[PDB]
Amino acid sequence: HKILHRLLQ
Amino acid sequence: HKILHRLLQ
Amino acid sequence: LALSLTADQMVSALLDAEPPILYSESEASMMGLLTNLADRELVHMINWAKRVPGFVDLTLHDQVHLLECAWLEILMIGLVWRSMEHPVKLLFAPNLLLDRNQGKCVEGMVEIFDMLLATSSRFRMMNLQGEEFVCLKSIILLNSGVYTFLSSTLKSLEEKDHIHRVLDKITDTLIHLMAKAGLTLQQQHQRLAQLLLILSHIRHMSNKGMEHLYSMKCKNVVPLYDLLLEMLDAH
Amino acid sequence: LALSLTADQMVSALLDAEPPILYSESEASMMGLLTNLADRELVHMINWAKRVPGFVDLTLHDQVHLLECAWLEILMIGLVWRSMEHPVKLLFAPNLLLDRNQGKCVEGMVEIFDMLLATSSRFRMMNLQGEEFVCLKSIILLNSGVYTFLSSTLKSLEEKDHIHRVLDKITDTLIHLMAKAGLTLQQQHQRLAQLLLILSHIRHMSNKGMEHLYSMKCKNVVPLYDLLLEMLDAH
Ligand SMILES: O=c1c(-c2ccc(O)cc2)coc2cc(O)cc(O)c12
Ligand SMILES: O=c1c(-c2ccc(O)cc2)coc2cc(O)cc(O)c12
Numbered sequence: 001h002k003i004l005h006r007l008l009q
Numbered sequence: 010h011k012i013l014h015r016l017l018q
Numbered sequence: 019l020a021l022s023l024t025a026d027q028m029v030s031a032l033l034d035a036e037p038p039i040l041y042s043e044s045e046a047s048m049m050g051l052l053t054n055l056a057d058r059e060l061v062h063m064i065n066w067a068k069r070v071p072g073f074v075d076l077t078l079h080d081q082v083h084l085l086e087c088a089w090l091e092i093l094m095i096g097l098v099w100r101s102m103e104h105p106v107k108l109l110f111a112p113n114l115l116l117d118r119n120q121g122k123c124v125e126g127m128v129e130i131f132d133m134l135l136a137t138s139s140r141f142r143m144m145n146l147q148g149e150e151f152v153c154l155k156s157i158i159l160l161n162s163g164v165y166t167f168l169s170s171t172l173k174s175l176e177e178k179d180h181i182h183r184v185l186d187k188i189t190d191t192l193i194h195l196m197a198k199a200g201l202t203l204q205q206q207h208q209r210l211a212q213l214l215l216i217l218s219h220i221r222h223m224s225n226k227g228m229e230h231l232y233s234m235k236c237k238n239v240v241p242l243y244d245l246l247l248e249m250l251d252a253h
Numbered sequence: 254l255a256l257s258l259t260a261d262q263m264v265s266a267l268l269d270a271e272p273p274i275l276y277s278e279s280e281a282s283m284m285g286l287l288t289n290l291a292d293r294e295l296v297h298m299i300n301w302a303k304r305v306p307g308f309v310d311l312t313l314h315d316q317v318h319l320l321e322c323a324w325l326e327i328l329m330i331g332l333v334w335r336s337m338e339h340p341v342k343l344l345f346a347p348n349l350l351l352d353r354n355q356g357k358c359v360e361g362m363v364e365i366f367d368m369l370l371a372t373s374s375r376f377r378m379m380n381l382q383g384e385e386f387v388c389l390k391s392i393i394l395l396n397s398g399v400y401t402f403l404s405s406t407l408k409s410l411e412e413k414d415h416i417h418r419v420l421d422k423i424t425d426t427l428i429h430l431m432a433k434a435g436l437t438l439q440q441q442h443q444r445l446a447q448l449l450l451i452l453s454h455i456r457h458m459s460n461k462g463m464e465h466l467y468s469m470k471c472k473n474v475v476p477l478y479d480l481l482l483e484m485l486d487a488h
Contacts, residue, residue: 007299012245016064189446211424214449225460
């Protein structure tokens with residue numbers, strides 16, 4: 001979830 | 010499947 | 019021929035073919051209650067299917083296929099419909115009204131109870147009508163397994179085209195109902211879409227429910243109910 | 254605010270936000286090819302999502318949720334769209350055109366390839382347009398995870414209502430497109446229904462595909478592609 005969260009931010 | 014087949018017939 | 023029925027003849031017929039009301043009769047005990055009820059309902063679902071305009075025009079093999087593909091989704095949409103008037107509760111049977119926390123009796127069940135409750139709340143706020151409900155249930159029966167029909171046979175292809183046309187009629191029927199309900203053309207398109215998109219959620223809950231039932235089955239916590247086992251196996 | 258966009262502004266915007274075209278770069282080898290492509294596409298899917306009218310109005314937590322719930326269905330609908338013009342083939346990438354039999358390289362894969370091919374054939378016969386395609390893909394993003402949003406928070410409830418209104422607009426947009434395409438009002442309702450019912454099939458194929466990917470993952474035949482593993486885990 002950390003990568004998804006990063007890319008979305 | 011035999012019961013289903015029977016009931017449908 | 020179902021293709022001749024008028025919108026009102028379609029709805030009235032569907033409403034008259036509704037299955038009768040059945041009463042239900044630890045983790046294993048909970049699973050037993052639900053699977054026992056589903057097994058009994060399946061017998062009546064088969065009788066109901068025969069009366070869905072167009073179903074009997076199909077080959078016995080295709081009738082079997084549709085029912086194998088949509089049975090759980092049909093039990094579930096009937097459940098959310100019955101639960102409409104009972105906020106936060108699931109009315110499995112007149113004598114079986116279960117709260118959300120009741121789903122904790124079984125590992126992994128509260129998850130699906132929440133999705134079911136969510137859909138019910140959704141139909142409530144939308145004020146879904148019974149005329150609409152029966153159309154949706156028939157659409158599920160016809161739509162779920164049609165694209166899994168063989169594509170390697172002319173007859174199968176014609177069977178798919180026939181189902182698609184009957185599905186078109188049901189669509190006209192739903193629009194018709196919203197029309198006389200006083201809805202504008204824009205509200206009709208929007209409501210029809212909302213309903214069909216919910217069917218997508220129901221397919222999801224059904225898939226999740228199926229995986230859950232198979233996993234329990236594997237834990238040998240599912241009674242030997244022959245018809246239910248037949249339908250489960252088909253997946 | 255997406256709610257202000259006109260039908261044409263909606264479609265044009267969606268068309269301009271389309272992700273770029275990517276090229277792909279035994280049983281393990283096959284799984285590696287597909288999972289590697291999906292991982293790379295996911296990066297672009299996230300960028301695309303940000304441009305879907307209404308997506309960024311949601312809390313970061315809800316954006317994450319929608320993507321976690323619909324990612325595979327979005328990759329799959331894009332795949333059937335690309336495969337339209339290639340009867341019997343699946344165009345994963347310009348340099349990766351696979352036939353049905355190619356699915357036999359992996360246990361359980363031909364089944365899902367057949368469903369994918371079926372949907373593609375379906376979109377072909379229906380002559381699905383790109384304007385429609387982008388609307389459908391956005392609907393999937395917004396609709397899949399909206400009913401899994403928490404119901405235990407006022408903000409979450411407002412988030413669900415917002416998504417539902419944006420979904421209504423997309424519905425008006427689809428009707429609009431079919432209108433200028435010369436379709437009668439009856440043909441419009443019917444086509445809109447056919448499209449939305451297909452989305453239900455796609456959700457099914459996605460669920461089946463997910464179970465397949467997890468099972469392979471368990472057989473340790475899935476490369477360690479971090480983003481793909483993140484999305485898979487979310488299910
Ligand atoms: O919801 C159900 C039902 C069920 C029973 C009667 C209905 O009318 C509808 C669903 C049956 O078996 C299950 C079995 C499960 O493992 C999980 C479930 O959520 C269910
Ligand atoms: O179809 C796919 C895809 C895939 C890849 C790129 C796309 O554009 C669409 C689907 C990825 O991983 C899988 C993994 C599987 O186990 C089975 C599948 O069918 C797939």
